[PDB]
Design a protein around this ligand. Sequence first.
Ligand SMILES: Nc1nc2ncc(COP(=O)(O)OP(=O)(O)O)nc2c(=O)[nH]1
Ligand SMILES: Nc1nc2ncc(COP(=O)(O)OP(=O)(O)O)nc2c(=O)[nH]1
Lengths: 251, 247
Amino acid sequence: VRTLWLRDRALDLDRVRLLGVLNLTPRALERAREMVAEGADILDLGAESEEEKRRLLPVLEAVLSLGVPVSVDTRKPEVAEEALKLGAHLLNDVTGLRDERMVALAARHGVAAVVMHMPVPDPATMMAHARYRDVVAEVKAFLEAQARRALSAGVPQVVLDPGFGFGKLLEHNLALLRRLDEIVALGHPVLVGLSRKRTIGELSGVEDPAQRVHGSVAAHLFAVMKGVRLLRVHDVRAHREALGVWEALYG
Amino acid sequence: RTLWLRDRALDLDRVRLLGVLNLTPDPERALERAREMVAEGADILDLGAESTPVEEEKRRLLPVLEAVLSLGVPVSVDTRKPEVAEEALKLGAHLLNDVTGLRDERMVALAARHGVAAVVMHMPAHARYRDVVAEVKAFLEAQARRALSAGVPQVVLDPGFGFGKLLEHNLALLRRLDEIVALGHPVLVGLSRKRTIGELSGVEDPAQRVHGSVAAHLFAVMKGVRLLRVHDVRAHREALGVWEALY
Ligand SMILES: Nc1nc2ncc(COP(=O)(O)OP(=O)(O)O)nc2c(=O)[nH]1
Ligand SMILES: Nc1nc2ncc(COP(=O)(O)OP(=O)(O)O)nc2c(=O)[nH]1
């Protein structure tokens, strides 16, 4: 019944959908072609960590020719503007649409936006702000506030993401994971991204970030069991395979 | 709850892994493989020498079994022949894994004589059932009672995924796995690399079915299963680290 707006079409959330990550930070149309072949539903491109335009736009234009929905991971409006101008289908804002300029672009271009949580919009100081009295309550309050605001300003739809690994201690990431159902209960499609994250390395005992697929799949299946229908992942094939089994069983 | 392993007990407060060591073509590198699986977190080693082919050729199992037992890790012997089990049990085996479901009174007697737990797996092959779940449950229960009444200290039930079962049958059992767990005995399952996983995940090569296998096993864990028969021990160890911390 639930769907995700992608600028010119609606994507069914009757089954879990995957946002395959394409990181352009220090042609990738080929990596994009592979991810689609592997089952990615949306391609998430980001040159975040202008020089951002130089790295992102050229690739964005090439990948868009595949006809698959493209999400742009950027916090700078000047980038979003140009990304949507070329045809981006989804705006992924790690700073949670704090910037009105971002809200405006979304509503103007008629594109949904992902509101992710960060205690503070500054990546360099977020870890100094992981001191929530009640992390689940506070994240829900922030998400719901950014959502109502964005929706009233003309944003077609908003996807909520608790932002795992952003200004959060393991204790906080765990609490949010275990009570993820409470975020889904807010009524908006929920997106999570635990691929490669420190939380996974900590719980699975894997120090190398590129070797965390089994723990990430496990965390993601748990999230799916909690009602999440959108996953931001690196190993697209691993999740398509796992979901092929999980969705046939849990349902 | 706990699982009796001949001279020690294993708590099932967390999922336990039975690492598979296949000693069939369809030597010494095997011990190295066992040590690796132990290093990766395997709680028990399941050694088998007959695809599921002749009793005399115990040269397959015994030599390896003796060497592996020197690692101190509990060993499960996957054999359906009393002669093999007997020799395996006298050497120190800790668990009797019988795919023919303890139908042979001789294996029941031996298990009881050596005071060793036995795995009762279901296997009819002809994949036709009026009601596979009801039928598999009735078989597992009946055999478990036959075994306990004979002195077997404990019995582990296993629905035998893939054994004389089509996809529909394996799916039904998985979806109602809680009903098998509800029989009061520890439950073991093994879907690693099996056809069911290939069918659901769309993976042609059995050797590349780890992701689908882990997903199936986590579902089983959610249903109450605390014993898994796997090939990729590390993958399961990592996935369970996350899963058990969250669930
Ligand atoms: N909506 C959303 N966007 C995100 N962007 C970057 C990262 C962190 O990923 P990272 O370690 O930087 O690796 P990569 O960007 O290559 O995926 N996580 C999220 C997330 O969790 N949710
Ligand atoms: N208790 C128990 N024993 C078993 N022995 C062999 C197989 C079939 O596994 P297979 O694909 O042949 O691989 P391997 O026997 O090498 O482990 N499955 C089971 C099972 O599911 N449960």
